[PDB]
Amino acid sequence: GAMGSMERASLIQKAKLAEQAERYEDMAAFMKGAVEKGEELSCEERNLLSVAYKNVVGGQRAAWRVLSSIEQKSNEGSEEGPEVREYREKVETELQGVCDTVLGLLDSHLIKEAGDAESRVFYLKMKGDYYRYLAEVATDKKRIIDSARSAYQEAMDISKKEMPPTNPIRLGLALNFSVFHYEIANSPEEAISLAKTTFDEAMADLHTLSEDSYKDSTLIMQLLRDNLTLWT
Amino acid sequence: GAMGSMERASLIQKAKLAEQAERYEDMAAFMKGAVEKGEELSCEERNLLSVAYKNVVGGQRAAWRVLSSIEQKSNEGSEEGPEVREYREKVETELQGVCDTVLGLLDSHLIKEAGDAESRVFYLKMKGDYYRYLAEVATDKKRIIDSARSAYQEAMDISKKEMPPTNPIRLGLALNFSVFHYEIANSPEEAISLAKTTFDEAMADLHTLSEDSYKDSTLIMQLLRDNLTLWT
Amino acid sequence: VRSLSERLM
Amino acid sequence: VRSLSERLM
Ligand SMILES: N=C(N)c1cc(-c2ccccc2)c(-c2cncn2CCN)s1
Ligand SMILES: N=C(N)c1cc(-c2ccccc2)c(-c2cncn2CCN)s1
Ligand SMILES: [Cl-]
Ligand SMILES: [Cl-]
């Protein structure tokens, strides 16, 4: 590991600098290095890891969608070479590599050492997210979908037992699981039901929250609401 | 060169795909490969080269500015490690590498084969731009500034002899040279004089242009005007 | 149009 | 505030 010679604290400090500089490839490398030190991650450090790789993979998914669209148009009255397919495959292969890197970190060994709900649910959700990103480009497709489903479901079970309905991690988990149902699993009715009950159960729990926790939860709830508006 | 095995036309086609996908690192690599085929570049191909590397270096300059700012604040009632300096140096070194790559392509051998004004002025301006980006982080600083000045001046001489005042390349050259004067060379009065005369001489030539050429020139003239507003 | 997923805190 | 330089066509 190219970050093996750098102090854990220095990697974290530089990941925060990279975030301010919007250098998310650097941020991912720093946080990967931090994870590979072997120590568990704090809540802040976990979110730095999530921020870095979500932005990296986020740019790859956007590029892949553009290229896939151009590729599908080429395969309709369309004039013909292999370049579009080749370059889409290049981005796709790079995207899959990032997803495998994250899944590798969760498997070695973030998840097995995560005992607390906030950490375990966070990592299992992340596992679901990155198997979902793999599913988006897959055509083993079924096993990838099942791996996402299984990760999300284990996370849902723990969050429902151990976290209040308004917990931001639980809310973000349910949001992404509902996206999985709608966009990946061809289960729009499951997606709508999950988003509804997640929103309603959080609504009924807002009265227990501080002003700052209320802002955090309602911000995420609005995404659930926005999706329901698009889905119904 | 990792692109040596790919057809020139395929590299150009994929550079255009990368632009649509906003994958400018890929775009730079493709166009670098295209340049290294040894053939001169068309006007379109020259702009693809410029688009790719300007975006790449543009992200590095923005990141460098963030880090440099954080670094200067650390060196004022400020609490102290070497991480900020180290990471700024990393981005800086990567920025300089990109600038050297471009200058290498212009020197080997785009400029010496560029005989037409549109191509020669374009490359010499580009040489000035990327020596200017080097100057922004330099602390040999004087030689870098002189190399930018000399490249810009040779380009200005040719453009004034061979191009109409409203030529977009001439306008973009004068704009960037005026930025050099103001931001790099500590010559704000030279910057203001150049922007004024460039704008006025283009204004007086708009009557010769088509509707589409009129739009192109006035779009760039507005930047000259905006700078003058900030400078005076 | 694509569904909205969790945003970074 | 930094001066505006040439924009991509
Ligand atoms: N540097 C980033 N991207 C983030 C850092 C943190 C964070 C977490 C704990 C302590 C300090 C910072 C984030 C966070 C995630 N959940 C809530 N928070 C903070 C807002 N209440 S997000
Ligand atoms: N793919 C890009 N980024 C660009 C391509 C071209 C271009 C140039 C010549 C022929 C075809 C396309 C650009 C250009 C630069 N000066 C004017 N133009 C076109 C607008 N009149 S910019
Ligand atoms: Cl490719
Ligand atoms: Cl560093």
XYZ file of C-alpha atoms and ligand atoms in Angstrom:
528
model
C 0.000 0.000 0.000
C 1.419 3.333 -1.141
C 0.043 4.983 2.028
C 1.620 2.438 4.373
C 4.436 4.814 5.314
C 2.119 7.670 6.369
C 0.750 8.133 9.879
C -2.914 7.292 10.378
C -3.562 10.795 11.727
C -1.782 12.371 8.749
C -3.918 10.375 6.302
C -7.090 11.539 8.061
C -5.864 15.142 8.161
C -5.060 15.021 4.440
C -8.373 13.366 3.559
C -10.063 16.404 5.122
C -7.834 18.728 3.089
C -8.610 16.748 -0.070
C -12.330 17.141 0.650
C -11.936 20.917 0.953
C -9.952 20.854 -2.296
C -12.570 18.583 -3.929
C -9.777 16.110 -4.735
C -11.807 12.978 -4.107
C -9.411 10.516 -5.749
C -6.750 11.725 -3.313
C -9.350 11.543 -0.541
C -10.149 7.905 -1.352
C -6.471 6.931 -1.426
C -5.871 8.602 1.945
C -8.880 6.939 3.577
C -8.036 3.564 2.036
C -4.611 3.980 3.621
C -6.267 4.899 6.916
C -8.486 1.803 6.826
C -5.506 -0.431 6.060
C -3.869 0.617 9.344
C -6.181 -1.996 10.892
C -7.955 0.175 13.467
C -11.703 0.665 13.467
C -13.055 3.982 12.196
C -14.778 6.752 14.125
C -18.125 8.068 12.888
C -16.350 11.044 11.306
C -13.739 8.821 9.684
C -16.454 6.511 8.338
C -18.151 9.475 6.661
C -14.847 10.679 5.198
C -14.474 7.224 3.656
C -18.030 7.384 2.307
C -17.619 10.925 0.950
C -14.415 10.102 -0.921
C -15.570 6.959 -2.716
C -19.141 8.133 -3.370
C -17.751 11.120 -5.273
C -15.235 8.960 -7.154
C -17.828 6.366 -8.147
C -20.382 9.139 -8.665
C -18.329 10.595 -11.496
C -17.866 7.148 -13.036
C -21.594 6.379 -12.932
C -22.410 9.707 -14.592
C -19.820 9.098 -17.315
C -20.973 5.499 -17.783
C -24.575 6.654 -18.213
C -23.551 9.145 -20.909
C -21.548 6.522 -22.798
C -24.165 3.781 -22.400
C -26.775 6.177 -23.798
C -24.565 6.974 -26.797
C -23.943 3.240 -27.188
C -27.659 2.394 -27.190
C -28.397 5.103 -29.765
C -25.684 3.592 -31.971
C -27.602 0.284 -31.855
C -31.000 1.514 -33.082
C -31.311 4.285 -38.790
C -27.925 4.767 -37.082
C -24.573 4.776 -38.864
C -21.835 2.442 -37.636
C -16.825 1.102 -35.183
C -16.027 -0.453 -31.801
C -14.899 2.784 -30.131
C -18.088 3.630 -28.214
C -18.313 0.112 -26.778
C -14.586 0.054 -26.014
C -14.574 3.342 -24.117
C -17.777 2.510 -22.240
C -16.138 -0.782 -21.259
C -13.077 1.146 -20.050
C -15.100 3.399 -17.741
C -17.177 0.401 -16.654
C -14.069 -1.620 -15.791
C -12.701 1.332 -13.815
C -16.039 1.713 -12.021
C -16.092 -1.982 -11.100
C -12.528 -1.717 -9.817
C -13.549 1.064 -7.430
C -16.555 -0.939 -6.245
C -14.342 -3.979 -5.640
C -11.864 -1.813 -3.720
C -14.594 -0.602 -1.351
C -16.135 -4.059 -0.955
C -12.635 -5.355 -0.254
C -12.154 -2.850 2.563
C -15.531 -3.706 4.100
C -14.692 -7.418 3.886
C -11.093 -6.925 5.119
C -11.977 -6.160 7.778
C -14.288 -3.264 8.637
C -17.535 -5.239 8.894
C -16.368 -8.159 11.030
C -14.954 -5.781 13.669
C -18.000 -3.460 13.617
C -20.047 -4.313 16.701
C -21.985 -1.101 17.337
C -25.153 -0.423 15.362
C -23.971 2.945 14.011
C -20.849 1.335 12.543
C -22.250 -2.057 11.528
C -25.347 -0.617 9.838
C -23.186 2.003 8.112
C -20.827 -0.595 6.633
C -23.569 -3.046 5.639
C -25.463 -0.216 3.936
C -22.247 0.755 2.153
C -21.866 -2.864 1.044
C -25.386 -2.729 -0.374
C -24.694 0.570 -2.131
C -21.573 -0.668 -3.903
C -23.086 -3.982 -4.935
C -25.947 -1.834 -6.260
C -23.511 0.264 -8.298
C -22.114 -2.987 -9.690
C -25.649 -4.128 -10.522
C -26.254 -0.928 -12.501
C -23.708 -2.022 -15.135
C -24.033 -5.802 -14.806
C -25.414 -8.037 -17.549
C -23.621 -12.981 -12.430
C -26.073 -10.066 -12.580
C -28.517 -11.978 -10.375
C -25.909 -12.817 -7.728
C -24.813 -9.176 -7.608
C -28.423 -8.106 -7.027
C -28.821 -10.736 -4.305
C -25.603 -9.584 -2.624
C -26.935 -6.020 -2.529
C -30.324 -7.194 -1.248
C -28.722 -9.353 1.440
C -26.438 -6.552 2.644
C -29.298 -4.037 2.742
C -31.595 -6.480 4.547
C -29.083 -7.335 7.272
C -28.575 -3.594 7.757
C -32.331 -2.974 7.877
C -32.860 -5.678 10.506
C -30.202 -4.196 12.801
C -31.348 -0.597 12.293
C -34.969 -1.467 13.091
C -33.874 -3.210 16.303
C -31.204 -0.777 17.498
C -31.912 2.690 16.059
C -34.791 5.175 16.325
C -36.829 5.739 13.149
C -35.271 9.198 12.675
C -31.640 8.058 12.870
C -29.928 9.571 9.790
C -28.085 6.321 9.019
C -31.302 4.301 9.268
C -33.073 6.883 7.095
C -30.301 6.895 4.495
C -30.294 3.095 4.518
C -34.041 2.856 3.922
C -33.810 5.521 1.213
C -31.097 3.629 -0.674
C -32.824 0.268 -0.179
C -35.993 1.761 -1.675
C -33.930 3.040 -4.616
C -32.569 -0.493 -5.005
C -36.110 -1.890 -5.113
C -37.241 0.643 -7.708
C -34.198 0.950 -9.975
C -32.443 -2.432 -9.604
C -34.857 -5.118 -8.400
C -37.884 -4.132 -10.532
C -39.962 -3.886 -7.330
C -41.509 -0.395 -7.506
C -44.301 -1.367 -5.099
C -41.770 -2.507 -2.498
C -39.878 0.751 -3.061
C -43.018 2.840 -2.520
C -44.103 0.887 0.569
C -40.674 1.179 2.191
C -40.435 4.912 1.481
C -43.938 5.522 2.856
C -43.490 3.621 6.118
C -39.980 5.007 6.642
C -41.267 8.567 6.239
C -44.341 8.061 8.428
C -42.428 6.315 11.218
C -39.829 9.102 11.210
C -42.506 11.820 11.198
C -43.998 10.325 14.365
C -40.567 10.375 16.058
C -39.501 13.953 15.241
C -41.043 15.220 18.486
C -38.187 13.568 20.424
C -35.400 15.396 18.585
C -33.387 18.533 19.169
C -33.506 21.369 16.649
C -30.262 20.135 15.064
C -31.303 16.472 14.964
C -34.676 17.589 13.590
C -32.918 19.380 10.725
C -30.749 16.333 9.978
C -33.653 13.878 9.843
C -36.112 16.059 7.917
C -33.454 16.828 5.299
C -33.207 13.113 4.500
C -36.960 12.553 4.817
C -37.464 15.100 2.031
C -35.607 12.794 -0.370
C -37.983 9.962 0.551
C -40.835 12.380 -0.168
C -39.316 13.530 -3.468
C -38.941 9.930 -4.665
C -42.534 9.096 -3.723
C -43.641 12.113 -5.766
C -41.749 10.790 -8.792
C -42.921 7.209 -8.190
C -46.634 7.990 -7.733
C 3.052 5.694 -25.065
C 0.063 3.717 -23.807
C -2.029 5.062 -26.717
C 0.505 4.056 -29.369
C -1.519 0.996 -30.369
C -4.753 2.935 -31.010
C -5.703 4.474 -34.348
C -5.435 8.250 -34.594
C -9.097 8.468 -35.622
C -10.145 6.261 -32.699
C -8.271 8.483 -30.232
C -10.019 11.569 -31.625
C -13.407 9.833 -31.563
C -12.858 8.785 -27.944
C -11.621 12.233 -26.908
C -14.989 13.565 -28.094
C -16.792 10.872 -26.093
C -14.681 11.699 -23.033
C -15.657 15.363 -23.404
C -19.351 14.437 -23.461
C -18.731 12.251 -20.405
C -16.724 15.050 -18.728
C -13.821 12.602 -18.345
C -11.073 15.114 -19.027
C -8.165 12.995 -17.780
C -9.188 10.370 -20.338
C -9.612 13.166 -22.885
C -6.068 14.433 -22.278
C -4.580 10.945 -22.589
C -6.430 10.352 -25.867
C -5.356 13.687 -27.355
C -1.776 13.241 -26.143
C -1.835 9.918 -27.979
C -3.257 11.657 -31.044
C -0.510 14.297 -30.993
C 2.180 11.633 -30.650
C 1.100 10.104 -33.975
C 3.218 12.885 -35.509
C 0.606 14.503 -37.757
C -0.409 18.126 -37.402
C -3.763 18.875 -35.782
C -6.904 20.305 -37.348
C -8.571 23.321 -35.737
C -11.120 21.013 -34.098
C -8.419 18.648 -32.872
C -6.412 21.569 -31.473
C -9.433 22.681 -29.445
C -10.028 19.136 -28.184
C -6.437 19.167 -26.937
C -6.984 22.552 -25.282
C -10.302 21.522 -23.708
C -8.877 18.347 -22.182
C -5.788 19.819 -20.531
C -7.398 23.119 -19.491
C -9.984 21.166 -17.499
C -7.337 18.867 -16.003
C -5.062 21.735 -14.986
C -8.116 23.805 -14.051
C -9.019 21.357 -11.305
C -5.423 21.297 -10.067
C -5.203 25.096 -9.910
C -8.459 25.286 -7.947
C -7.260 22.622 -5.506
C -3.834 24.258 -5.208
C -5.447 27.607 -4.389
C -7.530 26.031 -1.615
C -4.498 24.305 -0.100
C -2.199 27.321 -0.475
C -4.814 29.437 1.313
C -5.031 26.920 4.163
C -1.227 26.831 4.225
C -0.920 30.621 4.481
C -3.478 30.758 7.301
C -1.415 28.145 9.151
C 1.566 30.535 8.956
C -0.025 33.614 10.554
C -2.317 33.091 16.456
C -2.457 29.805 14.506
C -1.840 26.367 15.993
C 0.746 24.103 14.369
C 2.571 19.540 11.407
C 3.929 19.232 7.864
C 0.755 17.763 6.347
C -0.695 20.923 4.776
C 2.621 21.772 3.109
C 3.142 18.161 2.029
C -0.261 17.801 0.384
C -0.054 21.221 -1.270
C 3.342 20.165 -2.626
C 1.771 16.949 -3.945
C -0.934 18.780 -5.903
C 1.636 21.352 -7.026
C 3.997 18.650 -8.296
C 1.111 17.008 -10.159
C 0.110 20.376 -11.631
C 3.668 21.043 -12.813
C 3.803 17.583 -14.371
C 0.713 18.353 -16.451
C 2.161 21.701 -17.520
C 5.421 20.013 -18.533
C 3.474 17.390 -20.493
C 1.691 20.077 -22.525
C 4.848 22.138 -23.042
C 6.563 18.929 -24.131
C 3.921 18.291 -26.788
C 4.156 21.861 -28.090
C 7.954 21.567 -28.222
C 7.874 18.036 -29.717
C 6.767 18.989 -32.228
C 3.511 20.903 -32.672
C 4.976 24.416 -32.796
C 7.839 23.856 -35.233
C 5.471 22.302 -37.800
C 2.754 24.958 -37.320
C 3.043 27.331 -40.273
C -0.454 28.812 -40.504
C -1.404 31.692 -38.222
C -4.443 29.928 -36.733
C -2.288 26.980 -35.658
C 0.945 28.789 -34.779
C -0.771 31.506 -32.731
C -2.901 28.860 -31.007
C 0.121 26.810 -29.929
C 2.234 29.804 -28.888
C -0.680 31.127 -26.827
C -1.031 27.680 -25.257
C 2.687 27.760 -24.453
C 2.175 31.107 -22.736
C -0.831 29.807 -20.805
C 0.983 26.782 -19.401
C 4.124 28.689 -18.491
C 1.713 31.096 -16.773
C 0.163 28.233 -14.801
C 3.685 27.234 -13.775
C 4.381 30.829 -12.732
C 1.306 30.806 -10.478
C 2.970 28.264 -8.159
C 6.624 29.168 -8.735
C 8.866 30.659 -6.056
C 13.562 30.000 -11.658
C 10.352 31.975 -11.087
C 11.703 34.831 -13.210
C 12.675 32.577 -16.124
C 9.230 30.966 -16.069
C 7.613 34.411 -16.261
C 9.919 35.393 -19.125
C 9.096 32.171 -20.985
C 5.384 32.964 -20.704
C 5.952 36.574 -21.775
C 8.080 35.512 -24.741
C 5.539 32.933 -25.925
C 2.645 35.388 -25.595
C 4.576 38.147 -27.373
C 5.543 35.997 -30.357
C 1.884 34.978 -30.607
C 0.731 38.599 -30.361
C 3.099 39.714 -33.128
C 1.819 37.041 -35.525
C -1.850 37.602 -34.659
C -1.573 41.360 -35.208
C 0.028 40.774 -38.620
C -2.095 37.868 -39.856
C -5.492 37.947 -38.111
C -8.374 40.438 -37.949
C -8.949 42.132 -34.578
C -12.099 40.048 -33.985
C -10.476 36.649 -34.572
C -11.464 34.511 -31.545
C -7.931 33.118 -31.175
C -6.417 36.609 -31.297
C -9.030 37.813 -28.797
C -8.428 34.886 -26.449
C -4.681 35.444 -26.751
C -4.926 39.131 -25.858
C -7.291 38.309 -22.990
C -4.880 35.775 -21.485
C -1.852 38.013 -22.076
C -3.647 40.807 -20.211
C -4.366 38.368 -17.370
C -0.656 37.520 -17.359
C 0.230 41.212 -17.053
C -2.208 41.761 -14.192
C -1.887 38.548 -12.176
C 1.666 37.345 -12.942
C 3.871 40.213 -14.130
C 2.650 42.895 -11.682
C 1.840 45.143 -14.669
C -1.807 46.139 -14.106
C -1.449 49.213 -16.332
C -0.187 47.077 -19.216
C -3.084 44.687 -18.577
C -5.635 47.514 -18.695
C -4.126 49.101 -21.816
C -4.065 45.794 -23.697
C -7.653 44.953 -22.738
C -8.868 48.419 -23.761
C -7.207 48.498 -27.181
C -8.120 44.869 -27.898
C -11.780 45.582 -27.127
C -11.903 48.849 -29.078
C -10.146 47.426 -32.141
C -12.526 44.450 -32.149
C -15.585 46.686 -31.710
C -14.592 48.612 -34.840
C -14.298 45.345 -36.810
C -17.606 43.704 -35.826
C -19.351 45.274 -38.827
C -17.481 42.845 -41.117
C -18.732 39.691 -39.392
C -21.591 37.284 -39.912
C -24.190 36.795 -37.191
C -22.379 33.663 -35.982
C -18.905 35.224 -36.063
C -20.368 38.285 -34.329
C -21.642 36.075 -31.500
C -18.266 34.333 -31.165
C -16.244 37.550 -30.965
C -18.580 39.511 -28.682
C -18.740 36.583 -26.250
C -14.972 36.832 -25.750
C -14.980 40.640 -25.787
C -17.326 40.554 -22.789
C -14.584 38.888 -20.730
C -12.207 41.719 -21.652
C -14.935 44.120 -20.517
C -15.573 42.209 -17.283
C -11.867 42.285 -16.389
C -11.635 46.021 -17.081
C -14.593 46.517 -14.735
C -12.763 44.624 -11.986
C -9.448 46.354 -12.748
C -10.784 49.934 -12.830
C -35.372 10.299 -14.559
C -33.521 8.487 -11.782
C -34.468 8.078 -8.140
C -32.729 10.164 -5.493
C -30.355 8.282 -3.204
C -28.754 9.261 0.103
C -26.768 12.501 0.040
C -23.490 13.105 1.833
C -23.980 14.676 5.256
C -10.884 37.984 -6.834
C -9.070 36.631 -9.884
C -9.111 37.893 -13.452
C -11.146 36.063 -16.078
C -9.149 34.169 -18.692
C -10.168 32.687 -22.043
C -13.077 30.244 -21.911
C -13.360 27.054 -23.927
C -15.270 27.556 -27.171
N -16.049 15.818 6.615
C -17.361 15.246 6.397
N -17.750 15.061 5.223
C -18.256 14.874 7.582
C -17.899 14.807 8.923
C -18.906 14.438 9.810
C -18.659 14.346 11.179
C -19.217 13.347 11.967
C -18.944 13.293 13.326
C -18.106 14.228 13.907
C -17.545 15.223 13.127
C -17.820 15.279 11.769
C -20.138 14.200 9.198
C -21.343 13.823 9.780
C -22.033 12.652 9.502
N -23.123 12.674 10.250
C -23.124 13.794 10.952
N -22.046 14.507 10.671
C -21.713 15.795 11.257
C -22.891 16.758 11.096
N -23.793 16.651 12.231
S -19.924 14.456 7.507
N -15.387 19.665 -29.112
C -14.990 21.027 -28.826
N -14.763 21.352 -27.640
C -14.851 22.052 -29.955
C -14.848 21.809 -31.322
C -14.702 22.921 -32.145
C -14.693 22.791 -33.533
C -13.854 23.547 -34.342
C -13.878 23.386 -35.720
C -14.730 22.465 -36.300
C -15.566 21.706 -35.499
C -15.545 21.869 -34.122
C -14.591 24.126 -31.449
C -14.439 25.414 -31.953
C -13.359 26.247 -31.704
N -13.598 27.373 -32.353
C -14.763 27.260 -32.968
N -15.289 26.071 -32.729
C -16.562 25.594 -33.244
C -17.665 26.602 -32.914
N -17.784 27.591 -33.972
S -14.669 23.754 -29.768
Cl -10.888 2.982 -24.493
Cl 0.649 14.192 0.418
